[PDB]
Design a protein around this ligand. Sequence first.
Ligand SMILES: *[C@@H]1O[C@H](CO[C@@H]2O[C@@H](C)[C@@H](O)[C@@H](O)[C@@H]2O)[C@@H](O[C@@H]2O[C@H](CO)[C@@H](O[C@H]3O[C@H](CO)[C@@H](O)[C@H](O)[C@@H]3O)[C@H](O)[C@H]2NC(C)=O)[C@H](O)[C@H]1NC(C)=O
Ligand SMILES: *[C@@H]1O[C@H](CO[C@@H]2O[C@@H](C)[C@@H](O)[C@@H](O)[C@@H]2O)[C@@H](O[C@@H]2O[C@H](CO)[C@@H](O)[C@H](O)[C@H]2NC(C)=O)[C@H](O)[C@H]1NC(C)=O
Ligand SMILES: *[C@@H]1O[C@H](CO)[C@@H](O)[C@H](O)[C@H]1NC(C)=O
Ligand SMILES: *[C@@H]1O[C@H](CO)[C@@H](O)[C@H](O)[C@H]1NC(C)=O
Length: 326
Amino acid sequence: GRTCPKPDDLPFSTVVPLKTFYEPGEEITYSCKPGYVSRGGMRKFICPLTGLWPINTLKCTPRVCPFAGILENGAVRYTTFEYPNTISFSCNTGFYLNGADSAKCTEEGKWSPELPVCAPIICPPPSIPTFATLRVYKPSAGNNSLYRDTAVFECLPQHAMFGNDTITCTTHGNWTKLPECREVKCPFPSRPDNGFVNYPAKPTLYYKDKATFGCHDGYSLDGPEEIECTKLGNWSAMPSCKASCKVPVKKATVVYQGERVKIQEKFKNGMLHGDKVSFFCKNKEKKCSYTEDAQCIDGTIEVPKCFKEHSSLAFWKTDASDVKPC
Ligand SMILES: *[C@@H]1O[C@H](CO[C@@H]2O[C@@H](C)[C@@H](O)[C@@H](O)[C@@H]2O)[C@@H](O[C@@H]2O[C@H](CO)[C@@H](O[C@H]3O[C@H](CO)[C@@H](O)[C@H](O)[C@@H]3O)[C@H](O)[C@H]2NC(C)=O)[C@H](O)[C@H]1NC(C)=O
Ligand SMILES: *[C@@H]1O[C@H](CO[C@@H]2O[C@@H](C)[C@@H](O)[C@@H](O)[C@@H]2O)[C@@H](O[C@@H]2O[C@H](CO)[C@@H](O)[C@H](O)[C@H]2NC(C)=O)[C@H](O)[C@H]1NC(C)=O
Ligand SMILES: *[C@@H]1O[C@H](CO)[C@@H](O)[C@H](O)[C@H]1NC(C)=O
Ligand SMILES: *[C@@H]1O[C@H](CO)[C@@H](O)[C@H](O)[C@H]1NC(C)=O
């Protein structure tokens, strides 16, 4: 008689018992859903004779977990520290996340799992490779070293290193690949024909030992004057002495290294092996000049056939050097 209606549904709460109508004298209890609280706690109400439920002061509000916006040496992604939500973590470079990467604020107003910490990445003292020595290494964290620190070895004399010489601290707390130092010796160098070779005094020549070369008065070197033991047991290079050329004409203007020179004065003491010049030849049809090349190879140089060196006396004839380019 003059029943009460179904109670109002209010945010984040439950009503018990939930019926569609109530007799006067029946009781209902409002509770905030788990994870929410409210000033004054529950509300109980009794359906009165009027059939009208009283006013409901229920204030259902999500719990809040402790402030968690500051992760020393790292970064929290968050919207709000309220009951439904989760937050996630990362760390600045040189640091790792010691703990879980995300946390959740639970019904009990607690973070689970517990908030993490960023710790500095460190690598243990590095092992020294066989036949090596630490040239530079200073640990920045007691006996250990921090991220991106480096150390480098050098081998002992007569030993050749394979792979980069420095190692650095990875983000995973280990070091990069280590060098290998082996012993390497090469054979003796060959003395060159018409030349000499000098190298130090000992039964066996090892890595980065240096031998130097020379040539007699009419010959010059084919390669570098100095050579050394490479890491693979042979030599930098193995040069020979080749024969210079006599200048093949009496008077002619040629291109040596992009500039016109007079071959008789530029090579007054001979053309060296490998010296290349370009002679001037006359296209008759087009009344002009063009150039063909000639190179001194082991005492032999071959002037192009088209070339005609005019007599000193015959002044009328004009050298291809003086005729306009084609
Ligand atoms: C220095 O540490 C690196 C860290 O990677 C790993 O993480 C450690 C914490 C440990 O848990 C273990 O997983 C490794 O040590 C080493 O990295 C190597 O290189 C790859 C990339 O990091 C990787 O490998 C995987 O993938 C490749 C092909 O893509 C596969 O060939 C291999 O089977 C793996 O699935 C892996 O991280 C690791 N692999 C190997 C073979 O080492 C790194 O080796 C190490 N350096 C030294 C000198 O110790
Ligand atoms: C010095 O020796 C290296 C090593 O190559 C050699 O080749 C083997 C067949 C044998 O001769 C061994 O003594 C060495 O293993 C030479 O490096 C080589 O260079 C060319 C380039 O392609 C070729 O022969 C090989 O690919 C290279 N070697 C390897 C192992 O791949 C080098 O040229 C030699 N000479 C000098 C002056 O360094
Ligand atoms: C770091 O190394 C030292 C030796 O230099 C040694 O006493 C110990 O292993 C480390 N330091 C301390 C205080 O234990
Ligand atoms: C490898 O060695 C070279 C020459 O020693 C050096 O410049 C380079 O930095 C090394 N590699 C890396 C990744 O540092």
